[PDB]
Amino acid sequence: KIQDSLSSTASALGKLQDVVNHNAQALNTLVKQLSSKFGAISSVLNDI
Amino acid sequence: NFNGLKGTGVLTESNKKFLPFQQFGRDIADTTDAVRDPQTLEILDITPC
Amino acid sequence: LICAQKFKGLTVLPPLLTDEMIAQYTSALLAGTIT
Amino acid sequence: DCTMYICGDSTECSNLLLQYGSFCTQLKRALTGIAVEQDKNTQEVFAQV
């Protein structure tokens, strides 16, 4: 009967899905951050 | 350097599909990755080194 | 392909222990605790 | 609050602040995590029965 509990619902393995989701969110935020201009002339380096 | 696209990187053939009015290329990281040569119609993919 | 798009200076090093090795540890523990 | 604290009830400052990015977004995310964890603490401690 143990197997059905894991196989049926989708919230059983949240405690490990959360970790990888957090890491993905952090990486995505860091990558997307450089698109910000930070109050400078332009985000792209060469145009300055 | 394409009409105002300064940069570097290894350029290869771009087999991806562009709409007739579309020339730039952007990614999830939100940086230029593909272009279309104005002289010759083929599409170029600017892959990194 | 976000992992492939993370090339902009971001790397994901592989763990030292691989999945088969971890499974071998688990098998050893199981074969120990039941005999 | 994102903008009320920094330069609340201002127009041009509000315009010039939104170009920094998603700072207050992750601020609010962290604070929400703090709050839900705070509730979870009492839930864990007292609900053993």
UniProtKB/Swiss-Prot annotation, chain D:
Origin: domain of life: Viruses
Disulfide bridges in this chain: 2-24, 7-13
Protein purpose: Precursor of the fusion protein processed in the biosynthesis of the S protein and the formation of virus particle. Mediates fusion of the virion and cellular membranes by functioning as a class I viral fusion protein. Contains two viral fusion peptides that are unmasked after cleavage. The S2/S2' cleavage occurs during virus entry at the cell membrane by host TMPRSS2 or during endocytosis by host CSTL.
Official protein name in the record: Spike protein S2
Organism: Severe acute respiratory syndrome coronavirus 2 (2019-nCoV)
